[PDB]
Amino acid sequence: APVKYGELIVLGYNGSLPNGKSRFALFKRPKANGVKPSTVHIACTPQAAKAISNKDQHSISYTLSRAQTVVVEYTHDSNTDMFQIGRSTESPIDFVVTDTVQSTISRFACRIICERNPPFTARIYAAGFDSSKNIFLGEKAAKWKTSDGQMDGLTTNGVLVMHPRNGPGIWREISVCGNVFSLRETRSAQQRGKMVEIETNQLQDGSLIDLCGATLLWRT
Amino acid sequence: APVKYGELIVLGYNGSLPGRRKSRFALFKRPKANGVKPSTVHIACTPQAAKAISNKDQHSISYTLSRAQTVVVEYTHDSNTDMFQIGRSTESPIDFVVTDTVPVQSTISRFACRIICERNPPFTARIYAAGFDSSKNIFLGEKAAKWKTSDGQMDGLTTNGVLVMHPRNGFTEDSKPGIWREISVCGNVFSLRETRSAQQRGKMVEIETNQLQDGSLIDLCGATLLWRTAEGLSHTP
Amino acid sequence: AYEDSETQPFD
Amino acid sequence: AYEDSETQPFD
């Protein structure tokens, strides 16, 4: 049998009986499909142009102003498997979630990356790669340059995670690069919370995931 | 019988005794028009801007203003016009290959220039600097000269420049013989630089155009051509 | 459709 | 490849 990484159980808002879909297991893929960060582009060089346009390449594209877009390449990672969750039903979405016809839930809301070797650690990142293997953060989105000069940002309504142990059940925000922040002042605010240093985006057994209309339980 | 726009003749540097790789190449009206014309402007690596460069079925021109910005001007089909290209490369986009006659370093661009000819009378032929590569892309790098126009559009010079001297400056009552002038990636006329590959552009030259006349000379920095023609500006009033 | 609509801002 | 060379500056 393949390795089971964990299961996502949807917590329903209906007050209906818990169902039996509402559950989804994650399993080690036959070939790795995870990606990891790579080349940064500051201008529309032919290489950045490939990364966005080529559907065999992954890109995340940060919109800074009408003049400036940072395009960051995501190259293949043989150590990890990638699973995505969202409202869309398209090929990229391993687990389609639904409100419990306007939706606050993202089509491609987040990705879980699982190490393919023991102990198979799972990490959550905001946003999911669409069918063009592209992620886009628009001008209005909250973004920033980190202390080592890298791009990072938050989706519109964000991805929220509660851990069972630290390192007091308190929600934190997860950025597109897997960093952990305190909550915003309002759900869609264009201002990020304060960086939380000790905690990580590793999904512990019994972690809770919030996607703005769907709450999910992660078991290990 | 196809319309003969005109003929290009190589002015050999060697001093020896005078086809696609031969010394003369005629330009003929094409069965289906292949000319391009300016179109959509992009100022940041938007997905459409990325489509303009990676799609090998779309012409585009990339103006490298800065480390943080390159501007992608698309060019779309023009059914009224035929396009021809000259240069050092032997790839399919070059219609007339051109070598250093001075006899692997060369000052001649692989895609030297394009000549665009009207498909209906007077069949006027215009000249532009630089041609499209096999990706249908033209690149103007950071160090080359560029500017924004009165129309607020991109324009620029190649490194060594495309140099044209017409027989006449125009066809008016103050008309004069023509002097060596510089043509841009967009076909506007400028006075010569102080050195050949100098960064500063010459001054704008109004009134004179890039309309080739019978007897126009095209210097591609290491190759010189003569344009001979029965049609166009030189013959129609 | 529902799955293709754009993601609405909560605020 | 003389054809595939890069255009060197005259200056």
Residue numbers in the entry:
A (entry chain A): 13 to 32, 38 to 117, 130 to 196, 203 to 255
B (entry chain B): 13 to 30, 35 to 119, 130 to 263
C (entry chain C), D (entry chain D): 1 to 11
Study text:
The N-terminal fragment of PELI1 consists of 16 β-strands forming four distinct β-sheets, and a single α-helix. The FHA core is split by a bipartite “wing” appendage consisting of residues 45–96 (Wing I) and 157–182 (Wing II) consisting of the remaining two β-sheets (β3-5, β9, and β10-11) and an α-helix that separates β3-β4 and a large insertion between β3-β4. The MDC1-pT765 phosphopeptide binds in an extended conformation to a positively charged pocket within the PELI1-FHA domain, formed by loops separating β6-β7, β11-β12, and β14-β15.
Pellino proteins are a small family of RING E3 ubiquitin ligases mainly involved in signaling events downstream of the Toll and interleukin-1 (IL-1) receptors (TIRs), which are key initiators of innate immune and inflammatory responses.
